[PDB]
């Protein structure tokens, strides 16, 4: 921000940051040496406001907005000083509008194989528009050491900081200028939240796919489907990535198909995201 010496000042009620849809009052007070202003004007990003403006003091004026819904607006007020045909800038002010944070829910922490990271994400919820922060707390059920991590999206906690036992508590706190919520605590066991290394499809009746996982017990799911059909066909596996995983599929001739696969540590809670779409137009 470049500094502009103001010949006055501006102030907003309820405040410069307010809930969307609130009625707001903007006040502007002239303080210009040798100048009892004839009039005072308000501009929103250079557009003159011509209504709901009220002369109060001989020096103060008020602009009033109803159900103010814009997330951002820069405001300028100027004075018509006598002895001049031009307007002296009094001051400007930035106002902004949003909502207070919803309670973060759907908190989930997982560890992708070979990452060294625990990835905690959550549903922040309703868009807040304004600047909100997130503090992820981590508590060891063994030692009760608490760590806090600041983020504006999600968080990767390095596994080297999770060596105080395996049972942990994680909650996510959200805060902006309009409110501050906190999530229900999630208890995790580091061994229960692991997702096997990604699985990938490579070559197209026979489909070649493989993963670098080293998890002892891995279960998988491959689903196929004619591009134009809408019901998936899931073929459940219990695979073993010793050698490459090839999967044979019957299918009609000159038709285009789609395949995806996903795997998990047999029995664990989470899976991994489905693969990207592997297309295949077979011959006639």
């Amino acid at each position, epitope marked *: 921000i*470049t500094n502009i010496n103001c010949s006055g000042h501006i102030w907003v009620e309820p405040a410069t940051i307010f809930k969307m849809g609130m009625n707001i009052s903007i006040y502007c007070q002239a303080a210009i040496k040798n*100048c009892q202003p004839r009039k005072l004007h308000f501009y929103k990003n*250079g557009i003159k406001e011509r209504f709901q403006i009220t002369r109060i003091n001989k020096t103060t004026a008020r602009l009033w907005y109803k159900n103010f819904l814009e997330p951002h607006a*820069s*405001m300028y007020c100027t004075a018509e*000083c006598p002895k001049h*045909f031009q307007e002296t800038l009094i001051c400007g002010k930035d106002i902004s509008s949003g909502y207070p944070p919803d309670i973060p829910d759907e908190v989930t922490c997982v560890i992708y194989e070979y990452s060294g990271n625990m990835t905690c994400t959550w549903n922040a919820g309703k868009l807040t528009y304004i600047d909100t922060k997130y503090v992820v707390h981590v508590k060891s059920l063994e030692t009760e050491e608490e760590q806090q991590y600041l983020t504006s999206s999600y968080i990767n906690i390095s596994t080297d900081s999770l060596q105080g036992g395996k049972k942990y508590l994680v909650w996510v706190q959200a805060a902006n200028a309009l409110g501050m919520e906190e999530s229900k605590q999630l208890q995790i066991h580091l061994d229960d939240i692991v997702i096997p290394s990604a699985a990938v499809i490579s070559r197209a009746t026979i489909i070649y796919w493989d993963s670098q996982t080293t998890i002892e017990k891995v279960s998988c799911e491959m689903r196929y489907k004619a591009t134009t059909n809408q019901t998936w066909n899931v073929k459940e596996f219990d695979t073993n990535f010793t050698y490459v995983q090839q999967s044979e599929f019957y299918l009609e001739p000159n038709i285009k198909y789609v395949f995806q696969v996903r795997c998990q540590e047999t029995g664990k809670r989470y899976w991994q995201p489905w693969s990207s779409l592997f297309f295949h137009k077979t011959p006639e």
Partner: nanobody
Amino acid sequence: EVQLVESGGGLVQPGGSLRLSCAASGFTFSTYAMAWFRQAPGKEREFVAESWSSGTTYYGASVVGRFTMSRDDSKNTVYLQMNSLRAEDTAVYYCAAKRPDAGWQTYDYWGQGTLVTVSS
């Protein structure tokens, strides 16, 4: 890139006049606010004028009445007519472009500046 290049700087007498130019390019001119600033030796950068496509134009208290800003959106240029020049106006004059959704006092672009000396 974008570019703001000023012109019209030079020497002038106390009481004289002159006019600065500023050619603008790269960004959408109509939607940006254009501003003149100045910076005397040692003294700090100060506001002198600003003008919008809508026509809204306001001035710093120090130069209102004596100075007059205008802008040709076709020619993508702003001007600053400086009259009744006093020695106080001896300073380098800067052209500035302000984006609307930015702050009310954050200018993303600045010209190199033209020096204006008011002798005596």
